[PDB]
């Protein structure tokens, strides 16, 4: 299967998108490092991987704060130690000024810091980076998520910037902007049909498939620095 | 393989992108209708499909002018006759005012006309539409291709519009904007490295993989009305 | 006043935006050519100009079909004859395939044809071109206006393309994408407040001011090839 | 003149864009608060205002660090004290993770913090906010300015977000993305002609005119949340 002999780090993999991505990549033969601050949620991800029939040897669980220098180093050091290399990095991490600081620290700062540390290793394997953004970022307003949206807008710009700089080191960088996603009455179902053209709510697995597509050169090698929107058409309304 | 029991029409399949797409889909198990005005070029596509080991029964060759009402009807009538249904439509068709007229007629008008005719059948199979545009269309200038670019810009808008309207009929619509693609010295290689961040020229197959990705619900169901750029990063420079 | 000793052609000036623009420019001292197919509506524009206290000598009324070669030539020939030169061109001209043809002919084809004819004269005065588009064109869907929207999307691309090509001839090109505009209960007022963030409906004069801004080098010389959205914030929702 | 009886705060007004904007607004009759950390550079701005014939009573000079809570409060408290109200706010403030922190603190954090403090007063006068961004932010890569560009991308998103939220309080918000601007051989002149379609380098005054346009409801009331690019066409290449 694709990703055989590939090693991937998936941040924010203790739930939803990150979790589904880890399970998918693992099932695809990759050697995955899952990480998060909530050990119990993270172990649940590990259990879904094992349940899928994947060997426990292909999973590296790291409980850490990705916003700290030590957490970042631990995430990276344990993956290189156990797997020997790094091929894929899926950056899936993530009102008062205090909320602004916390929001940008997690959604932007930690991604930049972790990525800079991973670059040397990704260059060695001519790896891939997939940044998870959000349609919160786009040519429209997102007042309900003031700081999350601008942090993601910076993530989009960061993706374009790093894609051009890092491709010179054999690294492919792209991003995905998911719309509404659940599974991580009549009135609610009606509104759903109205707000999501697709007529169905997005699923963690739907996003995981797209992440895999972008992490696999066999299927997307010529796609570079693109912001791939996966929102059932919501942002077009 | 994916696309098994699926029927696809690929316009502009007598060369490059269209040809590689037809071969890929056929190899994937789909029943394909290839079409173009140059019979010899089209037969060459058919031969590559056969050479790939695909049964001749899975290929419907239609020599016709996709800009004419009759050509359009022939393309569609022969596919429904031989295959009984239609699941996928890959719209890959495509200075003086005369050049403007010819350019828009082929790149925009014929696509709209063919699509309108296909809609009823695509609705029946909850099919997919993949419109092939170009980075000639985008938030930048493209003076070397005055009419081709604006026609593609209309294709992008048309894609967004139809994606929202047609998803109500179970049809998924998306588009792809390819950058430079070849295979359909030192100075030239240097300039190439400079103009294409990827450092390598795009290949027809690279675009075909992305078309397949978008035509396959298993891999992209939640992607709707998106303009997927596949240009090795060129448009970001 | 600005536009003194300047000559401008305003198409679609028999009503709304075009009419308000003609009155504004005339009041600003420019020598204006108004045009349209409905003579009575056009004369009404002329009367508003005269009522504003502008000399009848500064107004050239041309009743013609801007989609025809003859109409185009008449519009241009009469302006150069009466005024001797051309400084500004405001291109404000503007389902079955038949509706598609009519829509693109007026909204795209005629603009390209007229502009090509005006270029030589605009180069002589280092003039300005202001293309009137619509938020119907943008990174979103516009299903209620299928052909009008794609034609405007092509207008946006055309604006970017010509801005780069024509600036080499001393001509500045930009475009404006107006949102909802009127003046060319409680339930309706409520919905209005909801659909237009501005809380007030756009007015022809609001758009005219922006056209003047872009036609005046003293206020916007460094703005080139930009798509200026004037929609009270509607497209951001 | 426009801006008569209007009070404006212009950050980063000790040089270039900010300085030219302060001089323009002052000459237009507004009561302006200029601010910066370099007292001598700031006084130079004041002197240009006085030299323009403006009364010293219409200028409030505040030497402060706009990134600090105290600087922000001083900037605002002195303007309200001396002028009694606030109508316009022009936010013109503005590799290792350390550089990232410093860059975002100045270009994003301080703007959000200052703006939140100004909002109450801007609501009272149904004021205007003009955020100065950069073409460093856009649908392209900007590798030479890694953190400055992403901070500006967040500024663009922030502008769209606040425009929708604040218009409900009678406040108009927009942003401007300047290209290359100087004045704050043959080989260099050649390259310039090549990199800037306009064929001429942007001037601080060129940007100031656009800021004034957006701060004046008489000329741009219906423009809301728009990212106005003023780059001589550079970003389109």
PDB file of C-alpha atoms in Angstrom, chain C:
ATOM      1  CA  UNK C   1     -12.419  70.521 -10.932  1.00  0.00           C
ATOM      2  CA  UNK C   2     -10.823  67.172 -11.769  1.00  0.00           C
ATOM      3  CA  UNK C   3     -11.397  65.892 -15.304  1.00  0.00           C
ATOM      4  CA  UNK C   4     -11.199  69.445 -16.643  1.00  0.00           C
ATOM      5  CA  UNK C   5     -10.023  69.184 -20.261  1.00  0.00           C
ATOM      6  CA  UNK C   6     -10.670  65.425 -20.119  1.00  0.00           C
ATOM      7  CA  UNK C   7     -12.955  63.528 -22.484  1.00  0.00           C
ATOM      8  CA  UNK C   8     -14.792  60.412 -21.371  1.00  0.00           C
ATOM      9  CA  UNK C   9     -16.956  57.781 -22.988  1.00  0.00           C
ATOM     10  CA  UNK C  10     -19.462  56.099 -20.677  1.00  0.00           C
ATOM     11  CA  UNK C  11     -21.302  53.102 -22.134  1.00  0.00           C
ATOM     12  CA  UNK C  12     -24.555  51.890 -20.586  1.00  0.00           C
ATOM     13  CA  UNK C  13     -25.075  55.478 -19.448  1.00  0.00           C
ATOM     14  CA  UNK C  14     -28.802  55.559 -20.153  1.00  0.00           C
ATOM     15  CA  UNK C  15     -29.552  54.442 -16.590  1.00  0.00           C
ATOM     16  CA  UNK C  16     -28.375  53.717 -13.056  1.00  0.00           C
ATOM     17  CA  UNK C  17     -24.605  53.495 -12.627  1.00  0.00           C
ATOM     18  CA  UNK C  18     -23.763  54.709 -16.111  1.00  0.00           C
ATOM     19  CA  UNK C  19     -26.119  57.660 -15.790  1.00  0.00           C
ATOM     20  CA  UNK C  20     -24.839  58.751 -12.378  1.00  0.00           C
ATOM     21  CA  UNK C  21     -21.258  58.422 -13.638  1.00  0.00           C
ATOM     22  CA  UNK C  22     -21.944  60.648 -16.658  1.00  0.00           C
ATOM     23  CA  UNK C  23     -23.543  63.312 -14.456  1.00  0.00           C
ATOM     24  CA  UNK C  24     -20.654  63.179 -11.977  1.00  0.00           C
ATOM     25  CA  UNK C  25     -17.912  63.390 -14.612  1.00  0.00           C
ATOM     26  CA  UNK C  26     -19.742  66.187 -16.441  1.00  0.00           C
ATOM     27  CA  UNK C  27     -20.157  68.118 -13.198  1.00  0.00           C
ATOM     28  CA  UNK C  28     -16.423  67.569 -12.720  1.00  0.00           C
ATOM     29  CA  UNK C  29     -15.650  69.392 -15.960  1.00  0.00           C
ATOM     30  CA  UNK C  30     -15.202  66.476 -18.356  1.00  0.00           C
ATOM     31  CA  UNK C  31     -16.541  66.323 -21.908  1.00  0.00           C
ATOM     32  CA  UNK C  32     -18.726  63.216 -21.946  1.00  0.00           C
ATOM     33  CA  UNK C  33     -20.085  60.824 -24.524  1.00  0.00           C
ATOM     34  CA  UNK C  34     -23.131  58.991 -23.261  1.00  0.00           C
ATOM     35  CA  UNK C  35     -24.590  56.134 -25.249  1.00  0.00           C
ATOM     36  CA  UNK C  36     -27.302  53.493 -25.322  1.00  0.00           C
ATOM     37  CA  UNK C  37     -29.985  51.897 -27.497  1.00  0.00           C
ATOM     38  CA  UNK C  38     -32.947  53.606 -25.798  1.00  0.00           C
ATOM     39  CA  UNK C  39     -32.920  57.219 -27.008  1.00  0.00           C
ATOM     40  CA  UNK C  40     -35.501  58.414 -24.469  1.00  0.00           C
ATOM     41  CA  UNK C  41     -33.627  56.954 -21.505  1.00  0.00           C
ATOM     42  CA  UNK C  42     -30.401  58.444 -22.842  1.00  0.00           C
ATOM     43  CA  UNK C  43     -31.918  61.905 -23.307  1.00  0.00           C
ATOM     44  CA  UNK C  44     -33.050  61.681 -19.678  1.00  0.00           C
ATOM     45  CA  UNK C  45     -29.370  61.309 -18.754  1.00  0.00           C
ATOM     46  CA  UNK C  46     -28.530  64.342 -20.881  1.00  0.00           C
ATOM     47  CA  UNK C  47     -31.268  66.335 -19.130  1.00  0.00           C
ATOM     48  CA  UNK C  48     -29.825  65.500 -15.696  1.00  0.00           C
ATOM     49  CA  UNK C  49     -26.451  66.743 -16.936  1.00  0.00           C
ATOM     50  CA  UNK C  50     -27.945  69.994 -18.234  1.00  0.00           C
ATOM     51  CA  UNK C  51     -29.974  70.405 -15.036  1.00  0.00           C
ATOM     52  CA  UNK C  52     -26.707  70.166 -13.112  1.00  0.00           C
ATOM     53  CA  UNK C  53     -25.732  73.339 -14.942  1.00  0.00           C
ATOM     54  CA  UNK C  54     -23.391  71.738 -17.478  1.00  0.00           C
ATOM     55  CA  UNK C  55     -23.128  73.231 -20.972  1.00  0.00           C
ATOM     56  CA  UNK C  56     -24.820  71.175 -23.692  1.00  0.00           C
ATOM     57  CA  UNK C  57     -21.578  71.494 -25.637  1.00  0.00           C
ATOM     58  CA  UNK C  58     -19.914  69.100 -23.187  1.00  0.00           C
ATOM     59  CA  UNK C  59     -22.329  66.262 -23.930  1.00  0.00           C
ATOM     60  CA  UNK C  60     -22.322  63.946 -26.950  1.00  0.00           C
ATOM     61  CA  UNK C  61     -25.351  61.623 -27.110  1.00  0.00           C
ATOM     62  CA  UNK C  62     -24.966  58.512 -29.238  1.00  0.00           C
ATOM     63  CA  UNK C  63     -27.910  56.171 -29.774  1.00  0.00           C
ATOM     64  CA  UNK C  64     -26.373  52.886 -30.878  1.00  0.00           C
ATOM     65  CA  UNK C  65     -25.982  49.145 -30.352  1.00  0.00           C
ATOM     66  CA  UNK C  66     -22.586  48.793 -28.700  1.00  0.00           C
ATOM     67  CA  UNK C  67     -22.521  45.138 -29.773  1.00  0.00           C
ATOM     68  CA  UNK C  68     -22.243  46.108 -33.446  1.00  0.00           C
ATOM     69  CA  UNK C  69     -19.163  47.240 -35.344  1.00  0.00           C
ATOM     70  CA  UNK C  70     -21.041  50.323 -36.572  1.00  0.00           C
ATOM     71  CA  UNK C  71     -22.349  51.267 -33.139  1.00  0.00           C
ATOM     72  CA  UNK C  72     -18.849  51.019 -31.719  1.00  0.00           C
ATOM     73  CA  UNK C  73     -17.375  53.131 -34.520  1.00  0.00           C
ATOM     74  CA  UNK C  74     -20.135  55.727 -34.162  1.00  0.00           C
ATOM     75  CA  UNK C  75     -19.592  55.988 -30.407  1.00  0.00           C
ATOM     76  CA  UNK C  76     -15.876  56.566 -30.972  1.00  0.00           C
ATOM     77  CA  UNK C  77     -16.018  58.641 -34.165  1.00  0.00           C
ATOM     78  CA  UNK C  78     -18.500  61.156 -32.737  1.00  0.00           C
ATOM     79  CA  UNK C  79     -16.491  61.608 -29.542  1.00  0.00           C
ATOM     80  CA  UNK C  80     -13.235  62.274 -31.406  1.00  0.00           C
ATOM     81  CA  UNK C  81     -15.019  64.531 -33.873  1.00  0.00           C
ATOM     82  CA  UNK C  82     -16.752  66.701 -31.289  1.00  0.00           C
ATOM     83  CA  UNK C  83     -14.089  66.604 -28.575  1.00  0.00           C
ATOM     84  CA  UNK C  84     -10.913  65.895 -30.537  1.00  0.00           C
ATOM     85  CA  UNK C  85      -9.523  63.253 -28.171  1.00  0.00           C
ATOM     86  CA  UNK C  86     -10.324  60.532 -25.623  1.00  0.00           C
ATOM     87  CA  UNK C  87      -9.001  60.302 -22.065  1.00  0.00           C
ATOM     88  CA  UNK C  88     -11.381  57.960 -20.261  1.00  0.00           C
ATOM     89  CA  UNK C  89     -13.405  54.896 -21.183  1.00  0.00           C
ATOM     90  CA  UNK C  90     -15.849  53.504 -18.649  1.00  0.00           C
ATOM     91  CA  UNK C  91     -16.967  50.115 -19.943  1.00  0.00           C
ATOM     92  CA  UNK C  92     -20.397  49.815 -18.348  1.00  0.00           C
ATOM     93  CA  UNK C  93     -22.181  47.643 -20.906  1.00  0.00           C
ATOM     94  CA  UNK C  94     -24.525  45.012 -19.513  1.00  0.00           C
ATOM     95  CA  UNK C  95     -30.638  28.950 -19.125  1.00  0.00           C
ATOM     96  CA  UNK C  96     -30.492  28.436 -22.899  1.00  0.00           C
ATOM     97  CA  UNK C  97     -27.332  28.689 -24.971  1.00  0.00           C
ATOM     98  CA  UNK C  98     -29.114  31.515 -26.786  1.00  0.00           C
ATOM     99  CA  UNK C  99     -29.199  33.561 -23.584  1.00  0.00           C
ATOM    100  CA  UNK C 100     -25.549  32.627 -23.117  1.00  0.00           C
ATOM    101  CA  UNK C 101     -24.681  34.051 -26.543  1.00  0.00           C
ATOM    102  CA  UNK C 102     -26.608  37.275 -26.001  1.00  0.00           C
ATOM    103  CA  UNK C 103     -25.195  37.719 -22.504  1.00  0.00           C
ATOM    104  CA  UNK C 104     -21.555  37.207 -23.480  1.00  0.00           C
ATOM    105  CA  UNK C 105     -21.919  39.254 -26.646  1.00  0.00           C
ATOM    106  CA  UNK C 106     -22.981  42.298 -24.622  1.00  0.00           C
ATOM    107  CA  UNK C 107     -20.984  41.859 -21.410  1.00  0.00           C
ATOM    108  CA  UNK C 108     -17.696  40.615 -22.876  1.00  0.00           C
ATOM    109  CA  UNK C 109     -17.391  40.701 -26.660  1.00  0.00           C
ATOM    110  CA  UNK C 110     -18.593  44.297 -27.122  1.00  0.00           C
ATOM    111  CA  UNK C 111     -16.304  45.535 -24.343  1.00  0.00           C
ATOM    112  CA  UNK C 112     -13.261  43.898 -25.918  1.00  0.00           C
ATOM    113  CA  UNK C 113     -14.169  45.194 -29.379  1.00  0.00           C
ATOM    114  CA  UNK C 114     -14.831  48.763 -28.229  1.00  0.00           C
ATOM    115  CA  UNK C 115     -11.713  48.836 -26.070  1.00  0.00           C
ATOM    116  CA  UNK C 116      -9.442  47.638 -28.874  1.00  0.00           C
ATOM    117  CA  UNK C 117     -10.753  50.526 -30.983  1.00  0.00           C
ATOM    118  CA  UNK C 118     -10.239  53.054 -28.186  1.00  0.00           C
ATOM    119  CA  UNK C 119      -6.703  51.951 -27.263  1.00  0.00           C
ATOM    120  CA  UNK C 120      -4.857  54.047 -29.887  1.00  0.00           C
ATOM    121  CA  UNK C 121      -6.569  57.203 -28.660  1.00  0.00           C
ATOM    122  CA  UNK C 122      -6.197  56.375 -24.969  1.00  0.00           C
ATOM    123  CA  UNK C 123      -2.480  55.815 -25.540  1.00  0.00           C
ATOM    124  CA  UNK C 124      -2.195  59.345 -26.936  1.00  0.00           C
ATOM    125  CA  UNK C 125      -3.605  60.894 -23.758  1.00  0.00           C
ATOM    126  CA  UNK C 126      -2.124  58.328 -21.367  1.00  0.00           C
ATOM    127  CA  UNK C 127      -5.759  57.655 -20.519  1.00  0.00           C
ATOM    128  CA  UNK C 128      -7.757  55.472 -18.177  1.00  0.00           C
ATOM    129  CA  UNK C 129     -10.049  52.475 -18.555  1.00  0.00           C
ATOM    130  CA  UNK C 130     -12.537  51.507 -15.864  1.00  0.00           C
ATOM    131  CA  UNK C 131     -14.345  48.234 -16.457  1.00  0.00           C
ATOM    132  CA  UNK C 132     -17.583  47.717 -14.558  1.00  0.00           C
ATOM    133  CA  UNK C 133     -17.901  44.108 -13.446  1.00  0.00           C
ATOM    134  CA  UNK C 134     -20.048  42.697 -10.592  1.00  0.00           C
ATOM    135  CA  UNK C 135     -19.672  40.694  -7.386  1.00  0.00           C
ATOM    136  CA  UNK C 136     -21.507  38.098  -9.470  1.00  0.00           C
ATOM    137  CA  UNK C 137     -17.881  37.359 -10.341  1.00  0.00           C
ATOM    138  CA  UNK C 138     -15.752  36.187  -7.435  1.00  0.00           C
ATOM    139  CA  UNK C 139     -14.548  33.209  -5.394  1.00  0.00           C
ATOM    140  CA  UNK C 140     -18.067  31.970  -4.754  1.00  0.00           C
ATOM    141  CA  UNK C 141     -21.101  30.666  -6.618  1.00  0.00           C
ATOM    142  CA  UNK C 142     -23.726  32.841  -8.327  1.00  0.00           C
ATOM    143  CA  UNK C 143     -26.404  30.366  -9.568  1.00  0.00           C
ATOM    144  CA  UNK C 144     -29.105  33.018 -10.065  1.00  0.00           C
ATOM    145  CA  UNK C 145     -27.027  34.695 -12.782  1.00  0.00           C
ATOM    146  CA  UNK C 146     -25.318  31.776 -14.611  1.00  0.00           C
ATOM    147  CA  UNK C 147     -24.072  33.588 -17.726  1.00  0.00           C
ATOM    148  CA  UNK C 148     -23.871  37.157 -16.421  1.00  0.00           C
ATOM    149  CA  UNK C 149     -21.497  35.978 -13.681  1.00  0.00           C
ATOM    150  CA  UNK C 150     -19.095  34.049 -15.907  1.00  0.00           C
ATOM    151  CA  UNK C 151     -19.032  36.923 -18.386  1.00  0.00           C
ATOM    152  CA  UNK C 152     -18.051  39.223 -15.511  1.00  0.00           C
ATOM    153  CA  UNK C 153     -15.442  36.716 -14.338  1.00  0.00           C
ATOM    154  CA  UNK C 154     -13.946  37.021 -17.831  1.00  0.00           C
ATOM    155  CA  UNK C 155     -14.174  40.815 -17.496  1.00  0.00           C
ATOM    156  CA  UNK C 156     -12.099  40.616 -14.296  1.00  0.00           C
ATOM    157  CA  UNK C 157      -9.450  38.488 -16.019  1.00  0.00           C
ATOM    158  CA  UNK C 158      -9.585  40.766 -19.068  1.00  0.00           C
ATOM    159  CA  UNK C 159      -9.010  43.750 -16.778  1.00  0.00           C
ATOM    160  CA  UNK C 160      -5.909  42.194 -15.227  1.00  0.00           C
ATOM    161  CA  UNK C 161      -4.577  41.159 -18.651  1.00  0.00           C
ATOM    162  CA  UNK C 162      -5.121  44.520 -20.349  1.00  0.00           C
ATOM    163  CA  UNK C 163      -3.816  46.441 -17.343  1.00  0.00           C
ATOM    164  CA  UNK C 164      -0.418  44.822 -17.751  1.00  0.00           C
ATOM    165  CA  UNK C 165      -0.342  45.036 -21.537  1.00  0.00           C
ATOM    166  CA  UNK C 166      -1.743  48.569 -21.870  1.00  0.00           C
ATOM    167  CA  UNK C 167       0.237  50.250 -19.086  1.00  0.00           C
ATOM    168  CA  UNK C 168       3.176  49.978 -21.492  1.00  0.00           C
ATOM    169  CA  UNK C 169       1.267  52.454 -23.636  1.00  0.00           C
ATOM    170  CA  UNK C 170       0.628  54.817 -20.744  1.00  0.00           C
ATOM    171  CA  UNK C 171      -2.901  53.555 -20.112  1.00  0.00           C
ATOM    172  CA  UNK C 172      -4.192  52.682 -16.637  1.00  0.00           C
ATOM    173  CA  UNK C 173      -6.797  49.899 -16.443  1.00  0.00           C
ATOM    174  CA  UNK C 174      -8.871  48.876 -13.406  1.00  0.00           C
ATOM    175  CA  UNK C 175     -12.308  47.404 -12.699  1.00  0.00           C
ATOM    176  CA  UNK C 176     -15.085  47.786 -10.129  1.00  0.00           C
ATOM    177  CA  UNK C 177     -17.375  45.017  -8.876  1.00  0.00           C
ATOM    178  CA  UNK C 178     -20.562  46.621  -7.521  1.00  0.00           C
ATOM    179  CA  UNK C 179     -22.802  44.751  -5.125  1.00  0.00           C
ATOM    180  CA  UNK C 180     -26.491  45.568  -4.823  1.00  0.00           C
ATOM    181  CA  UNK C 181     -27.400  49.010  -6.141  1.00  0.00           C
ATOM    182  CA  UNK C 182     -30.845  50.590  -6.407  1.00  0.00           C
ATOM    183  CA  UNK C 183     -32.362  54.014  -7.188  1.00  0.00           C
ATOM    184  CA  UNK C 184     -31.068  54.040 -10.763  1.00  0.00           C
ATOM    185  CA  UNK C 185     -41.744  46.781   3.763  1.00  0.00           C
ATOM    186  CA  UNK C 186     -40.637  45.939   7.292  1.00  0.00           C
ATOM    187  CA  UNK C 187     -39.838  42.412   6.140  1.00  0.00           C
ATOM    188  CA  UNK C 188     -37.939  43.664   3.094  1.00  0.00           C
ATOM    189  CA  UNK C 189     -36.037  46.208   5.178  1.00  0.00           C
ATOM    190  CA  UNK C 190     -35.098  43.459   7.620  1.00  0.00           C
ATOM    191  CA  UNK C 191     -33.767  41.175   4.891  1.00  0.00           C
ATOM    192  CA  UNK C 192     -31.854  44.112   3.412  1.00  0.00           C
ATOM    193  CA  UNK C 193     -30.136  44.753   6.744  1.00  0.00           C
ATOM    194  CA  UNK C 194     -29.273  41.055   6.740  1.00  0.00           C
ATOM    195  CA  UNK C 195     -27.948  40.752   3.191  1.00  0.00           C
ATOM    196  CA  UNK C 196     -26.016  44.027   3.082  1.00  0.00           C
ATOM    197  CA  UNK C 197     -23.685  44.531   6.076  1.00  0.00           C
ATOM    198  CA  UNK C 198     -23.600  48.263   5.277  1.00  0.00           C
ATOM    199  CA  UNK C 199     -27.226  48.335   6.405  1.00  0.00           C
ATOM    200  CA  UNK C 200     -28.076  50.585   3.487  1.00  0.00           C
ATOM    201  CA  UNK C 201     -28.693  49.848  -0.180  1.00  0.00           C
ATOM    202  CA  UNK C 202     -25.989  50.910  -2.623  1.00  0.00           C
ATOM    203  CA  UNK C 203     -26.699  53.965  -4.787  1.00  0.00           C
ATOM    204  CA  UNK C 204     -25.646  54.708  -8.400  1.00  0.00           C
ATOM    205  CA  UNK C 205     -23.750  57.717  -7.063  1.00  0.00           C
ATOM    206  CA  UNK C 206     -21.750  55.513  -4.660  1.00  0.00           C
ATOM    207  CA  UNK C 207     -20.384  53.575  -7.629  1.00  0.00           C
ATOM    208  CA  UNK C 208     -19.825  56.738  -9.686  1.00  0.00           C
ATOM    209  CA  UNK C 209     -17.559  58.175  -6.982  1.00  0.00           C
ATOM    210  CA  UNK C 210     -15.364  55.070  -7.155  1.00  0.00           C
ATOM    211  CA  UNK C 211     -15.245  55.193 -10.951  1.00  0.00           C
ATOM    212  CA  UNK C 212     -14.105  58.824 -10.732  1.00  0.00           C
ATOM    213  CA  UNK C 213     -11.489  57.849  -8.119  1.00  0.00           C
ATOM    214  CA  UNK C 214     -10.030  55.263 -10.516  1.00  0.00           C
ATOM    215  CA  UNK C 215     -10.211  57.574 -13.543  1.00  0.00           C
ATOM    216  CA  UNK C 216      -8.263  60.289 -11.699  1.00  0.00           C
ATOM    217  CA  UNK C 217      -4.481  59.802 -11.571  1.00  0.00           C
ATOM    218  CA  UNK C 218      -4.216  62.455  -8.867  1.00  0.00           C
ATOM    219  CA  UNK C 219      -6.050  60.065  -6.546  1.00  0.00           C
ATOM    220  CA  UNK C 220      -5.200  56.557  -7.802  1.00  0.00           C
ATOM    221  CA  UNK C 221      -2.243  56.590 -10.210  1.00  0.00           C
ATOM    222  CA  UNK C 222      -0.487  53.663  -8.518  1.00  0.00           C
ATOM    223  CA  UNK C 223      -3.589  51.457  -8.581  1.00  0.00           C
ATOM    224  CA  UNK C 224      -3.304  49.171 -11.605  1.00  0.00           C
ATOM    225  CA  UNK C 225      -5.298  46.159 -12.786  1.00  0.00           C
ATOM    226  CA  UNK C 226      -7.172  45.944  -9.497  1.00  0.00           C
ATOM    227  CA  UNK C 227     -10.702  44.566  -9.067  1.00  0.00           C
ATOM    228  CA  UNK C 228     -12.234  47.083  -6.663  1.00  0.00           C
ATOM    229  CA  UNK C 229     -15.250  45.592  -4.880  1.00  0.00           C
ATOM    230  CA  UNK C 230     -17.940  48.115  -3.911  1.00  0.00           C
ATOM    231  CA  UNK C 231     -20.682  46.023  -2.306  1.00  0.00           C
ATOM    232  CA  UNK C 232     -21.419  47.248   1.216  1.00  0.00           C
ATOM    233  CA  UNK C 233     -19.677  44.067   2.353  1.00  0.00           C
ATOM    234  CA  UNK C 234     -22.155  41.602   0.809  1.00  0.00           C
ATOM    235  CA  UNK C 235     -19.594  39.319  -0.849  1.00  0.00           C
ATOM    236  CA  UNK C 236     -17.850  38.813   2.503  1.00  0.00           C
ATOM    237  CA  UNK C 237     -20.900  37.097   4.002  1.00  0.00           C
TER     238      UNK C 237
END
